[PDB]
Design a protein around this nucleic acid. Sequence first.
RNA 1: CUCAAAGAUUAAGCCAUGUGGUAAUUCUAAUCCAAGGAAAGCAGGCGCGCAAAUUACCCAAUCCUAAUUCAGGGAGGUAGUGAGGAGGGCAAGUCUGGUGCCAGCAGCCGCGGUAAU
RNA 2: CCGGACGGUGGCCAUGGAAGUCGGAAUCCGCUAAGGAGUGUGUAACAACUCACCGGCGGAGUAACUAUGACUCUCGCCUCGUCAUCUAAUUAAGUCAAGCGUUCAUAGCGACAUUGAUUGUUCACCCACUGAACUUAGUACGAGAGGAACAGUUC
RNA 3: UCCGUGAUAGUUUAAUGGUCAGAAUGGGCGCUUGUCGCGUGCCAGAUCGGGGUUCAAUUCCCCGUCGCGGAGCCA
Lengths: 386, 608, 136, 55
Amino acid sequence: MKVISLKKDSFNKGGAVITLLPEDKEDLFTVYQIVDKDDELIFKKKFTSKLDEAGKKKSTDLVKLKIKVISEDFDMKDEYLKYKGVTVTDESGASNVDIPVGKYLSFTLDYVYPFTIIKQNFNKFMQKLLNEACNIEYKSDTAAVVLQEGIAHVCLVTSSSTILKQKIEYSMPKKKRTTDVLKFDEKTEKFYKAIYSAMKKDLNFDKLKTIILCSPGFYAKILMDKIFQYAEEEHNKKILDNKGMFFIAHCSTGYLQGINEVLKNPLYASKLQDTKYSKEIMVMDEFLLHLNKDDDKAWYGEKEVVKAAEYGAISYLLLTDKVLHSDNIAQREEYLKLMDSVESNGGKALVLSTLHSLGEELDQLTGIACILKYPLPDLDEDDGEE
Amino acid sequence: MSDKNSRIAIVSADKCKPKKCRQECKRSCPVVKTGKLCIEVTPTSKIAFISEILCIGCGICVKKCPFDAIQIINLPTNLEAHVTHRYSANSFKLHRLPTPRPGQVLGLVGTNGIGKSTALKILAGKQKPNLGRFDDPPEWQEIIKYFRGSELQNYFTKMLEDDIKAIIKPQYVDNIPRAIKGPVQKVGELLKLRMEKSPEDVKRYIKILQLENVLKRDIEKLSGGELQRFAIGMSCVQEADVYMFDEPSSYLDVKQRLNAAQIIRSLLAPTKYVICVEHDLSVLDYLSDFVCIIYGVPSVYGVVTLPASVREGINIFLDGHIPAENLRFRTEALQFRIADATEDLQNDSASRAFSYPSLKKTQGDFVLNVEEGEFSDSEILVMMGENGTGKTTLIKLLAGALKPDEGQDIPKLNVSMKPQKIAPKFPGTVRQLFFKKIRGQFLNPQFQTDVVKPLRIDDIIDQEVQHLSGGELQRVAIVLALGIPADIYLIDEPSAYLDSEQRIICSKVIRRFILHNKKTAFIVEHDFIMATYLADKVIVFEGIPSKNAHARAPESLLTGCNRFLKNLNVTFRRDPNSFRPRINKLDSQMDKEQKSSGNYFFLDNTGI
Amino acid sequence: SGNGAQGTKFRISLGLPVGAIMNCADNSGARNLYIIAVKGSGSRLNRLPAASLGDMVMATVKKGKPELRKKVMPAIVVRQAKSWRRRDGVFLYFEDNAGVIANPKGEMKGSAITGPVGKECADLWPRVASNSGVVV
Amino acid sequence: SLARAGKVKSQTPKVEKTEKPKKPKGRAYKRLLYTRRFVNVTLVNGKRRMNPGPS
RNA sequence: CUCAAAGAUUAAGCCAUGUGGUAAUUCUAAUCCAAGGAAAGCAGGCGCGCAAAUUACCCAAUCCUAAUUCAGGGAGGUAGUGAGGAGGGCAAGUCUGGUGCCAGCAGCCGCGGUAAU
RNA sequence: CCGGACGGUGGCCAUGGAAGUCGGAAUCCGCUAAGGAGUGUGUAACAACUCACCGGCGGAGUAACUAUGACUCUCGCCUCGUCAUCUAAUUAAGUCAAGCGUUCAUAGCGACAUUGAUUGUUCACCCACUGAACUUAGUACGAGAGGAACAGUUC
RNA sequence: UCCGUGAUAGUUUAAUGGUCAGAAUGGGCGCUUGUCGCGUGCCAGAUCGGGGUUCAAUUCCCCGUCGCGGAGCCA
Ligand SMILES: Nc1ncnc2c1ncn2[C@@H]1O[C@H](COP(=O)(O)OP(=O)(O)OP(=O)(O)O)[C@@H](O)[C@H]1O
Ligand code: SF4
Ligand code: SF4
C-alpha cells in the first residue's frame, strides 16, 4: 500500500479522507476491511457509451464517478475487488461532472490508479491495517541487502507483502587505488548501524526473520563478519542468539534486481533457511516429532488445535497460506483471535506456505496445528472427536 | 505436466472394529472436515467405506487406524486401464486375464492372492466378471467389449454361446476331501465314469501317474499327493477342447510333478487348448509354450501381463522387476549361496554328532531300509526322493515317534520336530500356542522380518487354528520348531502350501539359525532350490514308491545332486544370465556331453 | 568399474587413455565416445588415466544426436584393439575401440549392441550381457 | 482475473418453464401456421405484425 | 422409408492375432532363439490428428481362377455399425424478472454506465 | 559404608501449567534425636531419585510505475567485464566464562578482557578419479528415514 | 594511504575589508487567458557537522564527514 493522503477534517472529528493506491491482492484485502457500506469513493473509468439514436454517437472522455457504496464482489484468488453503488449526484458540479445522474455504476479496482475513500467509520483497527500493513494472515518474512562495490540497496519485505518498507543504502567500498582506502570499513560499519536501527523500528524485529546479504565479490561475507564484530562490541544478544536470520548470498547484479537473481537462481536458496521457511520448518518438525510418538504434546487440525488451546497447552502455533488464501475471508478472523488467545496462554507463531511440501503436510491437517510446552492429555475429549 | 495418478483404498473388515476406534476414520479425515464424501459410513454392515474419487491420498487415516485396517496406495493409473472384475467395495479387484491358445499350453505364475484362481473361473464360465461395476445378470456381452483389443475377446464369444465347456481341475487342495467321498465311491469309480477316451486311456493314464495302488482307496482317505493326481486323471479322460489346470504340482513329490507335466502336455498334441497355473518353475518351464506373469500385492490386486515366451517369461520373473509395468514386484532378489560364500570352520563340535546304525521299519505292506550314516554338528542334511519312499518314516524314527522294526536309535539329544502335513488338532488360539513354545523368540528381530510383519499374525492372534489358512499356518509351524532349543531340529517338507516369497523366507531362516546357533538340522524337501541353499550334505532315497525304499548316508552337495538328478535324467545346464537351472532335453549332443562329465547342475563353481 | 559392477576384474592391458575416441556401439543415437576419465583409476604425476575392456569411463559424444552432444555421461568399454592377455594364455584383440553409453548403476541407455563384445565386459555388466550378440 | 467466470448465469434466479398445450408436429403445424397467418387473419394496425405484446 | 460414404487429407507412420536327428520353421538326411542358428488386401490395434465401423455370415447372385468337377476366392454379396433465431442485413414492435462497459452477446454494423428491442 | 529425610502446606504472588527445585522477594511455625517455604537429578504439571542433617555402625532536478532521462537548469582501470558460442572443463594455538547451543555455560562452540582445461603463473576456478569393490548385509540399531564392522576375496 | 582541492535557500552556484549574505532556477502568490501553461507583477535561508580565539566570526584557526583530482618506481 501507498497512502497519498489521509486527513482529518475540522468539521468531523471522526472519519477521514484517504487517498490510497492498493499494490497487490494483499492490498485488495486491505481495502476491503476499510471500506464500509455508505462511504463514498471517487475514482475514474471511461464512460460515454450512449445510444444511437440521434448521432453516431458517443464522445469518449475519462469520466470520474463519485459513487456511494452499496455492495462488494470480492474474490481474493481472482485478484478482483469490485464496489457496486449509486451516483452521489454532485448537484454542486464540482464533482461528478460529465456523468449522467440516475444510473448505478461500479468500480473494479486496479493497482494503477489511486482512489479516494470518504469514510464515516474510520476506526483504530483499520488504521493499524493502513500503516503497519494488514496481513492478519502473514505470507512473507524477508529482508535483503544487495551490495556491489559502490552501490548498495537495503531492501526488505513486509509485515504484509513482497512490498518494500524501506529502501536503505550507505557509502559502499569501491576498490580504491591504495589497500581499499579506509573510508570503506568506517562507512560499511555505519550501514550496519543504519540497517539495525531501521529494522528495529519498522518491524518488531521479531516478525521478520530474514536478512539475505548478497554481493558480487567477497563483500557479503566481509559484511557478515563485520555485523557480528560490532555485535560483540555492543553485547547485542538480539543479533548474537540468532545465527539464523542472516544468510550470505552471492549474485552478479545488485540494484533491486539482485534479490530475484539470488532467490530464484538455485545458487543460494532452495528450502534451506531463506529465513521465510525458517522457524516455519523448525516448529513444523517438532510438531510431528511429538505427535507421532503419541505424546500429547503436539496436536493438529481446525477442530483439534482450538480444543488443544482450550486446555491451554500450546506454544508454537502452526498456521498456513492455503486454508487462508484457498478461498474464504471471514474464517481468518477466528484463527487470528485463536493465535492471540493461545499466546495469552503461551507461544510464538509460524505461517507456512502451502505452495510447498511442509505447508502441504500441515494442510492435510486443516492448515492449523500446534506444539505444546507441556503434555495436556485428551484434548480430543470435552469436544467429542479424535 | 505432472504424470497422472490415482488413489485406491482397500480395507480389511477382519481387522476392523469400529466400536473400539469409534468411526475414527471419518472424524480424522480432512476431506470430511470440509464436508466432503471421502469416507462414508455404512449403517448396515457397519463398515467404513472409502470412496476413491473424493480421497486426497493423505494417508492420515491409515496412520490413525489403531489396527492397520486401511491401506491407501498411489498408482500412476496403471490399474485403471485394465479393470476386469472386483469383488466388492474396498476388496480385491482383478486386472487382465491370461490368453488361451489351441494346441499349446499357456502358463501362469505369481504369488498367492493375485487372482490366478479367479481368472480360471472367469474363463470357465463359472463366474461372470462385473467389470469393476454392476455387470451381474448375465452380461457376457459387456465382457467381450471390455476385452476388445485383446485376444480373449474371441474366447468370450465362444464361452457365452456355450460351444465349448471347459473342464476345470479345482485349485483348493485342502477343500477337495470334504467335497467328494468315493468320487462317490473310490477313485476307481471316478476314472471309469469320466473316461470318454480310450479304454487304453484308463490303463495308460493310471500307469503314467503311478495311481495303480491308489485306485481301491477312497478320495477322503487319499494323501495329498494322491489326491492331486486323481484330479489330473479326470482332466485327461474328459472329452472337451479346453483343459484348465490350476496348480497341478501341489502336494506332489519331485518325481511325480515332472510326470504330471508330461502327460498334461500330451493334450497339446491332439491340438487341444491347455491353460495351467504353477508355483513351480521347473514344472512350469516344461509344460508351457507361452507364459504369463501375475504380479501385484497380495489380496490387493494382481495384473496379468501380455503373453510371453517360455524362456523369456521365466527370466523376467527372477529379476523381480518388469519394465513396461515398471514395478519392482519383489523387494529383494533371490540368490543362492555359491558355497564359496559360506563360512569356513573346522566342524565336529564334540567330535561329530550322533550316529545311527542300519534301521528298518516295516509296516507289513511297505518296507524301509536305511544305511548306516553319520551326522555331525552344525551341519544341515537335505532329504530328497519321492513320497511313499519312507522319507517321512525315517524322520519319525529319529524323532523317537516311531519304533524301528530293527535297529535302534536311542540318543541323549533333545529333539524338536515339525510334521509334514499340518492339520490343526490343538485347541487354543495362535498366539497362545506359540507363546507356550517360547516367548523371546517372538521378540527377536529375525522373527519380525520373516513371520510377524509379512502375514500380520497380530490379526491372526485371536483367530482359531481351525479357522486359519493353509500357507499362513505353514510358516507359523516352521517357526515354532525353531522356537525351542534343541541339539537337533527336524523339519519335514517346509515348502508345502507356500509361494515363491514364502518358501525363500524359510530358506534363509533354517540356514541362518543353524549356522549361528551351531546346531544341526535335517530338512526334507521336493524343491530343488530350497535344498541347495540350506544344506551341506544330502541323503537320496530310491526304490519304488508304495512298495519298498532305501536311504543312503550323507554325501556332499555335488555328489548327492548327481545321484538324485541321474534318476530323473534331466540336466539343468546353466543359464548364463539368470544362473538358473536350464533344463536339458533327452537324446542330445550337448546333454550327451554332460552325461559323460557328471554335471546335472551348475553354479558359480569351476567345471566344464 | 565400481557401482553395479558385480564381479571383480583381472587386470587387462590399458588401451584407451583420456582423449581417445571409441565407436559408439549401441543404438542410442551416439556415433562415438570421447573418453575424459576412467573410474577407479589411480594417480601418478603425468600419467594419463586410461581405460580397458569393461572399464567404466566418463565420456562426451563428439558425433551423434544433438540431445546427446555437449554433455558428460558414463560409458563402458566393450571392445579393445590394444591387445591384451587372458589367464588361459591368450593374446587377443578387436578390430576397433568401442563402448556403450550407460548410467552410473550400469544400465545401457540403448537396447542393442552392434558388433561383438569381449567376455570380460559381459561378465562384468549384466545389462551388457543381455544386449550382446556374439561374445568374444 | 478468472474471477467472475460464470457470474451472471449463476446469479440469474431460476424460474422453471411452464406447462403448456402440446403443439402439433408436421403437416398439422403447417396447417395451424396457414390458418393463423392467412385464414381468419388477426390484426392490421397500420399494416401487420407477428407477435407484439401490448400495443 | 427406401438409397449407403466411409481412416485419403494427419503419418507410402508402426503393427498383436485370425532307420533318424533336431531349440524351433510347410526343416529335412524387426521377431524366436538349448547361444548354435531360424524367420497401401478383410477384420482388428496403436499412433496421428479437425477428422472416418465388426476381429461377424456366405458362396446364393456376378463372375473370375485350376482339369471333362463343381474345388477354390475376405475378388464379390449379406448382414452390423452409421439422419437455431426474435436490434437491423434477416423475419420476428419482442414483452416480464435478473444484470450494471462486471458477467456476456455479437460473422460484419454494433450491444451492454437500473428503468438493456 | 548404611536407617531414618517428617506435619502447618501444594507458603505468597506472579499462575497458561509452576505443589521446594525456570521466576519476583520473604526464611516462618510445629515436630522430635534431626529433618532447608528446599542442595542438585525435575514427568507438562506431585511423584520418583537425590543432599543437608539427625542417627546404626562540470554538478543536480524531472517519474499520470520502479528504473532510465526526451526536457529545464549551472561553469578498458575495477576485470577473470556480463550473454551467448566452442569444451566433459575455458584468467584462451590459550586462559576467565557472559553468551550461543530451544532444557543445559565447555558435547560442539564461545563476547568481552588477557598470556586435464584457462592463465608465466604461485594462487585461484572448474571437469573427472579415487583406498576401493565384493560378499558380511539391506542385517545388527531404528517408529521409519537409514544404515554398520571384525572374518574371507579381488584389485 | 599521503600530499593537494572543495561544500551558501528545494537545487546550481556568486561574495566579504572581521561588524554588511546573493543571484539564477525551482516553488508558493495573484493577473493573464475558454481553461492550463508561457508572460507580467509579489514572495521566503541555523552559509556542511564541529569546537576555539575575539568587543563583534558567513568571513580567522583546528578536526571530521563527503565528493574530487594527482602520485604510485628497484620486486
Ligand atoms: N469372495 C471374495 N470377495 C472379495 N475378494 C475376493 C473373494 N474371493 C477372492 N477375492 C480376492 O481375489 C484375490 C484372490 O484370488 P485368486 O483366488 O484370484 O488368487 P490366486 O490369484 O489364485 O492366488 P493364490 O495363489 O493365493 O491361490 C484375493 O487376493 C482376494 O482379495
Ligand atoms: S478400522 Fe481401525 S480405527 Fe477404524 S473403526 Fe476399525 S478399529 Fe477403529
Ligand atoms: S487418505 Fe486422507 S483423504 Fe483419503 S480417506 Fe484417508 S484421510 Fe480421507
